[PDB]
Structure 1
Amino acid sequence: SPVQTLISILRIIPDWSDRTQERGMRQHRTLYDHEKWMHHRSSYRHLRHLLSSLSSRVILSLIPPVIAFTLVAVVIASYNTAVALDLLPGIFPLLRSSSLPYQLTAPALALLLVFRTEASYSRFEEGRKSWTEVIAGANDFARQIISSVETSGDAQLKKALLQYIVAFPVALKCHVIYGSDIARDLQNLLEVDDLLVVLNSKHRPGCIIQFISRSLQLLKLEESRRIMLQSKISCFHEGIGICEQLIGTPIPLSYTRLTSRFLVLWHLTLPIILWDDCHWIVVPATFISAASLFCIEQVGVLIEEPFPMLALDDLCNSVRNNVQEALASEKLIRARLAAKG
């Protein structure tokens, strides 16, 4: 009760920040087109990024660490002022230091921070490339199935097989994104009895891969054609592997706890070394330093698991859009080439 009520009050802003950041990660994202790129590289982008700072998910996550160090600066400033006004006994010293130790270690701090954020950006690029390969693989496999499968007796199996290659990116998205309804997202993509088996499996992408591999065995193909055709599933297994490792295995905790601890120690004694040249300007100085330096580390932490920063619904809808345009256009391209003669 006496000390428990103090911790509960201090546990309000960080709880609000955690709720705000996590709700901001469920936001729907969209593929950039040309007119959105024009808006991106505009003269007003510097004004509009500054005025949208208070609604930014990254800025609102800095509120706990920036407030924490600003009160540390205010307490150091208050104590140093009390010593300067002789309001405390002579035994109490003035908390001041030379900036020279910090001038020797500043480049070490900057290189650690920016390299940690570069490691996070590398894992985002790995995610983006893996999804590029899965979507190009599904497009390539669907294109080849539309051309390869010809027999009138395999029409139902060909239709089923084209439904699973569209459904695989959706299942993989529902595997990598938290709180995703695969049943709703596959309702119009798989058959009612088709989807029941998929919903009953622990590994939904793997299960759909299994339906793909068994359809290729029941098709009436020459063995060379089937071997060529079942070589395209390895793309899906590779995609599952890369996507599961970015979720399972983060950047080593030693490497990221180093950046965390360095930044916390640097802002704890930053008002002490800055006292001689700044006096009460250590409060705004520590506020701006903590906001700037913790923002780099915050950006690194948010993109370290990158699948929520990708337009995976639009990437998945692109494969579905491509197979319809193709099955509609088949009639026309077939009549056009018949005419060449």
Structure 2
Amino acid sequence: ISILRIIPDWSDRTQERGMRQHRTLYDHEKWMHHRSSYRHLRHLLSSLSSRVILSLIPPVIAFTLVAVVIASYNTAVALDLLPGIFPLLRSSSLPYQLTAPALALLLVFRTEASYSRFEEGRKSWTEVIAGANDFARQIISSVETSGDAQLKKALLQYIVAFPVALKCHVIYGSDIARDLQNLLEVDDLLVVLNSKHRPGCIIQFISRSLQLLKLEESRRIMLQSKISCFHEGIGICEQLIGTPIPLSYTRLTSRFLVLWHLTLPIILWDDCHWIVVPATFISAASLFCIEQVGVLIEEPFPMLALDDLCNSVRNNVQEALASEKLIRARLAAKGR
């Protein structure tokens, strides 16, 4: 049997297969294609290849089968085939015209709640990447002692490694031992691997490196006040992945949807007979789609493009280390 727990398992397999897809940062050409006139034709032709439509098949099939049974029973009562003790399963649409606004508002507000979490995650990552950039810039400008060349090089290696370590902590199946192969030294990477909380371990490396630096006390206090950003980022990411939206607030939306779609063929039979099947199909493909988008967007980190966000910090620190000698030579030639 196709409906006997086969469609829902295939839907889940495909949905989890689509979660681990490579994302890239938008540049200007992608934005041109996004704003283009062909966008509507594109989105149409891209369905049956998207997570949201492929994960929507079970509900829509279930609610179309119910409408076919309602229709085939009301059609059996008329032009009667069965004993006259069975009534027509029909009703008035007036009760559901006074409640449609409530269901519409509840679905749209739940989707907005989910988008809020998406935005929170994006901002948290924005502040982490900005802070890693600013800390690395300050370390390059501040650390000047010839005797602390070795520790500075290590100190800039642990900053670039922090966004990667945090990205491996919030993404289900990633290998931190492969992403940090070329960043950390062989002996420092084993200390990170033995730790249960890898980003916490890299923070401890950075904090201990800043103590052994022969800086003035004022400058050391200034430098070590930038670590608080990494703590805040770790916190926000852990809470966004640990603490979902209220389950009451979500089961409400689910229960209301199922009840509305079960009795919708009964209120619509009186005016459109046998047209309730496509009406139920369209209602189930629209209202359930709105809920599904919100469910997918809610743990936000699988759809954020963190690899290019980490690569940006890596590239920026490499560029800043390469451009040091030219800038120092240009600023040395001021009045001489």
Quickly name the TM-score band, shorter chain normalised: over 0.9
Quote the Cα distance in structure 2 between the aligned partners of 1:66 and 1:21. 16
User: Per the alignment, in what secondary structure is the counterpart of residue 254 of structure 2?
Assistant: helix
| Aligned CA distance change for structure 1 residues 290 and 29 (closer, same or farther; 3 Å) | same
How far has the Cα of 1:278 moved from its partner?
A: 1.2
How far has the Cα of 1:146 moved from its partner?
A: 0.3
Quote the Cα distance in structure 2 between the aligned partners of 1:212 and 1:257. 44
Runs of 4+ aligned residues of structure 1 deviating over 3 Å after TM superposition are none
Quote the Cα distance in structure 1 between the aligned partners of 2:145 and 2:284. 67
Quote the Cα distance in structure 2 between the aligned partners of 1:91 and 1:334. 97
Match of 1:235 among 222, 229, 234: 229
Q: Deviations over 1:48-67 (max 9, x none)?
A: 10111111110000000100
| Alignment TM-score, normalising by the size of structure 2 | 0.99
Quote the Cα distance in structure 2 between the aligned partners of 1:8 and 1:87. 30
Answer 1 or 2: which has greater helix percent: 1
How far has the Cα of 1:88 moved from its partner?
A: 1.6
How far has the Cα of 1:277 moved from its partner?
A: 1.3
Quote the Cα distance in structure 2 between the aligned partners of 1:340 and 1:13. 73
**Gaps in structure 1 of 5+ consecutive residues:** 1-6
Quote the Cα distance in structure 1 between the aligned partners of 2:88 and 2:128. 62
- Aligned position for 1:117: 111
| Aligned CA distance change for structure 1 residues 283 and 9 (closer, same or farther; 3 Å) | closer
Quote the Cα distance in structure 2 between the aligned partners of 1:234 and 1:327. 24
Quote the Cα distance in structure 1 between the aligned partners of 2:224 and 2:48. 52
Quote the Cα distance in structure 2 between the aligned partners of 1:279 and 1:52. 33
Cα RMSD between the aligned structures?
Answer: 0.9
User: Per the alignment, in what secondary structure is the counterpart of residue 283 of structure 2?
Assistant: helix
- Aligned position for 2:82: 88
How far has the Cα of 1:204 moved from its partner?
A: 0.3
Quote the Cα distance in structure 2 between the aligned partners of 1:275 and 1:338. 86
Match of 1:169 among 160, 163, 168: 163
| Aligned CA distance change for structure 1 residues 13 and 258 (closer, same or farther; 3 Å) | same
Match of 1:311 among 297, 305, 308: 305
Quote the Cα distance in structure 1 between the aligned partners of 2:39 and 2:160. 37
Which has the higher mean CA deviation after the structures are superposed, 114-123 or 86-95?
A: 86-95
How far has the Cα of 1:9 moved from its partner?
A: 5.3
Which has the higher mean CA deviation after the structures are superposed, 274-283 or 234-243?
A: 274-283
Match of 2:135 among 123, 133, 141: 141
Percent of pairs identical after alignment? 100
Q: Deviations over 1:115-157 (max 9, x none)?
A: 0000000000000000000000000000000001000110010
Quote the Cα distance in structure 1 between the aligned partners of 2:244 and 2:35. 32
**Gaps in structure 2 of 5+ consecutive residues:** none
How far has the Cα of 1:89 moved from its partner?
A: 1.1
How far has the Cα of 1:8 moved from its partner?
A: 8.6
Q: Deviations over 1:141-192 (max 9, x none)?
A: 0000000100011001000010000000000000000000000000001000
